[PDB]
Design a protein around this nucleic acid. Sequence first.
RNA 1: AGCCAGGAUGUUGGCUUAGAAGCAGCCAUCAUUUAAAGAAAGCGUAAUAGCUCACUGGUCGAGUCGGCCUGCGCGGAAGA
Lengths: 157, 141, 94, 131, 38, 136
Amino acid sequence: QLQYTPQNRSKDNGRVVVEGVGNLMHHIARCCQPIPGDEIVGFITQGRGISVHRADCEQLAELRSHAPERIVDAVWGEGYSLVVRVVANDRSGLLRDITTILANEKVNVLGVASRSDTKQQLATIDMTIEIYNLQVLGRVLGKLNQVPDVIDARRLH
Amino acid sequence: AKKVQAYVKLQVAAGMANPSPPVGPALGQQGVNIMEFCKAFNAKTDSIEKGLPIPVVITVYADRSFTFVTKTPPAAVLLKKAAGIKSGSGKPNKDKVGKISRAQLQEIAQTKAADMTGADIEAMTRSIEGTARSMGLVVED
Amino acid sequence: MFTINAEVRKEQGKGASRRLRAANKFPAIIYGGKEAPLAIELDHDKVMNMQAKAEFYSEVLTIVVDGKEIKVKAQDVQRHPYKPKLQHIDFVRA
Amino acid sequence: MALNLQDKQAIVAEVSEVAKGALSAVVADSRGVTVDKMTELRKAGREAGVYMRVVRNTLLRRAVEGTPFECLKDAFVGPTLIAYSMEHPGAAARLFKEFAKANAKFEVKAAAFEGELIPASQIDRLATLPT
Amino acid sequence: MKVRASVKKLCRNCKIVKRDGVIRVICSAEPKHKQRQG
Amino acid sequence: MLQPKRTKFRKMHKGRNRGLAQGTDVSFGSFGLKAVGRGRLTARQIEAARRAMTRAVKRQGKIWIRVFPDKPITEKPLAVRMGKGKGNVEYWVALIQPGKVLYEMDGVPEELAREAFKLAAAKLPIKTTFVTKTVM
RNA sequence: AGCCAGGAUGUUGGCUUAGAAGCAGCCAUCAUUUAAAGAAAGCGUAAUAGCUCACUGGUCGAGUCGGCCUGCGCGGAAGA
């Protein structure tokens, strides 16, 4: 029920300035969920604006395999949204421990696509957030990392 | 001179000095004037170069009065210096950050040649290289 | 280099074999090339320490018996189900 | 440590330098400090690179089986700890007095080495430092 | 003092002892390690 | 737990546990915790062991479990008069003959294998012994 | 096995952090003098410093240390 103006934030633009020009309708690529990290070289789709695909990733590379001339780079202008994932030990509240750190977290924790299964203690969380600065994440990761049950805190592409 | 009855190192940079928070206690727990520490750290560093953290073996004699002898700038300091970096590797040896041609590992070595154990100066460089690796740097020499 | 002492076996029954095994020595067999396969009673412990080394299960080995030195190899072994000691050995007359 | 010949890597190394072994001096250093021989190995590692290098190993099993060669007077030099005074670059020279410099400086002391007759002087510090 | 059926070193400064046949892990450090039975 | 999904029959004769099991020599991993005594294993015991063995070495390393329960075990409901038909399979088990290697392990330094296996062995009802993978 | 000593330098290794200087956590883990001293095994601080180990050098005067397979015991062991 805690579930976006960010859908109008890209409309607020300035998130990208492709090859020397901004505005250009673009979006996050579900594969390399870019953030103001290691560049971005947005692909030009025939419709639906630019398909920013972070920078360097198979799909971003396979479009090279196709007709690469469609692809171009982009700076960043001025850092909204991101999907993140952390692995844990089964549960017994070790997920609630995440939920506890989730309670600690300040950023909007949207998609809480939790998972675990396996034949045992392997557990995870497909959390999605609106994190801003790149530095702010590791902080959460560090806050996630106090709990050794939080066996693998990390952002995923 | 008097041994170590209030002798410790330090980590300010260049001629810069004064605060208690970072290392004031080095003198703060001693009682020696922190402002005498300022001007006098410059008694040595009034000519000493910027942002290259140079430690000073505080030398407070067995009778309150003192002197001091800074170390020539640290190897880690002269790597932040020679590498073109500002900080060490994001993650050690598995990645690099700034180059230091061995003529510079050696020049810095000739800084330590009068401030460190040695016989083989390039071996001093071997220490500065392990130093370069541990902190993770563009190893080029 | 690897070398053992051995014996032509007397009775070859399961019983005599078993107790012989209780006698810190155990039956082993050697065959290949041509000779009628020969029963080889042999001391346990020596073989035990000798086998620990992996080379034992690959290299040419020399088995003693009345002075003759056959140069077989370690073809196979059957160990005790839950004890360190062996139980039986098969030798290709390399 | 390691087998006889490996401990001979030590003793044959020592003896290899015993060939240059002229002036003789010893001491049982059951007490000292890293700083002094840090500056002394720094000394040999400065004024003349590597000379009279002392990888001290004083057994009545090493100095003894290291004695036969030269400095026969080493027969009564082995029990308890033993320092190595070796000549090479300026034979029968100050190499001894350097440990006099160390003497006044906490090594407990060089403890009045009896010295031997290979160059000349024994317990006394040499009077001939080359003109 | 523990009187359980196990008893074994609880550091190293703990020590095995067989007084009256009875095993008692005395500990020259932690008083707590002291135990009996074995 | 580790019960077998589906079965030809929902109940089975008590049977006998004589003999020396075939699952002997180390196969997959680098070591293994061979059984020594004789006895049976409730599936939950295997799980208690697996965890109290896995957690012992964290997620690094690898663990094979040579045995499977499958044998059904019924029980008469409490305070029930004899006969009246077979009970109900309360739990599953595995007949374990001596020499039936259980948890084969791999990927970690031997000392660790000794470390964990000692623990899981503590959970187990039957005596055990560590074993190193052998060359033929 | 005890007892003497040393136990360092680059260097307070980096990253991180208010701070890591052996020891917040993540990685490097080489080099120098080396008798020998882990970019530190334990304690320890706000970081420090400090104290002890590894290891090495003295002493001493003979075996000694760690495992395996086994024979008999011991502990675990409380009722009217």
